[PDB]
C-alpha cells in the first residue's frame, strides 16, 4: 500500500501490501511502579527457565495428587469411606 492513489501494491512497502499491521499494539514503556517491578522480578523470576519449570510442574503435580489421594479423609471421599450397609444377595442365591 503506497497509499497515494488507488494503488495498494508496492514492492517497496511489502508489509503494507500484505496487510501485516499491529492493530492494537502499544509501545509506551511506562506501565507499572519501580518497586513493584523490583519485587516481581526478584520473586517470580525463578520460574523463567522452561525446562526446570516443566520438571518442577510434573514433580509437584504428581506429589500433590498422590498426597491428596492417599491421605484424604473418609468423610470427604465416598470411595475411601467404603460400604456401610449389609450386602444384597444375588438372584439365584449367589453372593
Amino acid at each position: 500500500k503506497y497509499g497515494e492513489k488507488s494503488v495498494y501494491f508496492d514492492l517497496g512497502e511489502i508489509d503494507n501490501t500484505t496487510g501485516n499491521w499491529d492493530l492494537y499494539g502499544n509501545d509506551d514503556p511506562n506501565r507499572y511502579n519501580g518497586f513493584q517491578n523490583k519485587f516481581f522480578e526478584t520473586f517470580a523470576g525463578a520460574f523463567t527457565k522452561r525446562g526446570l519449570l516443566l520438571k518442577f510442574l510434573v514433580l509437584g503435580g504428581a506429589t500433590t495428587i498422590g498426597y491428596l489421594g492417599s491421605t484424604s479423609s473418609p468423610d470427604l471421599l465416598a470411595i475411601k469411606n467404603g460400604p456401610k450397609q449389609v450386602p444384597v444377595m444375588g438372584p439365584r442365591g449367589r453372593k
Binding site: K1, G3, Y8, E13, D15, N16, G19, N20, W21, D22, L23, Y24, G25, N26, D27, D28, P29, R31, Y32, Q36, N37, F40, E41, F43, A44, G45, A46, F47, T48, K49, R50, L53, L54, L57, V58, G60, G61, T64, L68, L76
Partner: protein, 163 residues
C-alpha cells in the same frame, strides 16, 4: 445520504476483514490497547503477572460455589485447590506451547508496523525467552490471585451477596 460508517480494513479493500464500530472505536481501541497483552514495550514478566493475577482471582468462584464439596465444611479449601490445579495445568500448557512454537534464534514474529505505517520494535513476547518469562510470571500471578481470593472470601469474613 452518502455518509457511511463501515470501511475496509485500514483502507485496503483486498485484505480480508472490515473496520467496524466494534473493531475500531476510540473507547474499544483504547481499552484493547491498554490491556497487558498489547503493551509491547513492557517486560513480558510483569504482563504475565497481571494476567495470571486476574485469571487466578476469577477462577476461584466457579470451583467453590459449584463442586462435589460445595455443601460441606471445606468447600472453600477444595475450590481453591481446584483453581490452583487448573492454574498449574494451564502453566504446563503454556510451557509446552512455548517450547513447540519458538526457538532460541528466531528474532520475533509479531508485526512491527502500526496501522498508520509507523515502524516500531517488534514485541518480545513472541520469543523463546519472552514466552518463558511470561509463563513464569503467569504461574506466580495465578497462584497469588487464587490465594488472595481465598483469603478475602474465607480467611476474612467480608460478607458478600452470594459468597
Amino acid at each position: 445520504e452518502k455518509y457511511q460508517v463501515i470501511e475496509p480494513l485500514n483502507g485496503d479493500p483486498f485484505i480480508g476483514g472490515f473496520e467496524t464500530p466494534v473493531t475500531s472505536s476510540p473507547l474499544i481501541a483504547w481499552y484493547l490497547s491498554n490491556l497487558p497483552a498489547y503493551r509491547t514495550a513492557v517486560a513480558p514478566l510483569l504482563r504475565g503477572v497481571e494476567i495470571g493475577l486476574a485469571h487466578g482471582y476469577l477462577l476461584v468462584g466457579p470451583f467453590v460455589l459449584t463442586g462435589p464439596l460445595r455443601n460441606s465444611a471445606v468447600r472453600g479449601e477444595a475450590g481453591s485447590l481446584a483453581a490452583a490445579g487448573l492454574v498449574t495445568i494451564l502453566t504446563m500448557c503454556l510451557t509446552i506451547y512455548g517450547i513447540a512454537s519458538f526457538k532460541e534464534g528466531e528474532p520475533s514474529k509479531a508485526p512491527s508496523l502500526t496501522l498508520t505505517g509507523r515502524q516500531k520494535d517488534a514485541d518480545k513476547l513472541q520469543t523463546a525467552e519472552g514466552w518463558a518469562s511470561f509463563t513464569g510470571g503467569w504461574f506466580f500471578g495465578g497462584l497469588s490471585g487464587v490465594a488472595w481470593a481465598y483469603i478475602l472470601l474465607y480467611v476474612l469474613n467480608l460478607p458478600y451477596p452470594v459468597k
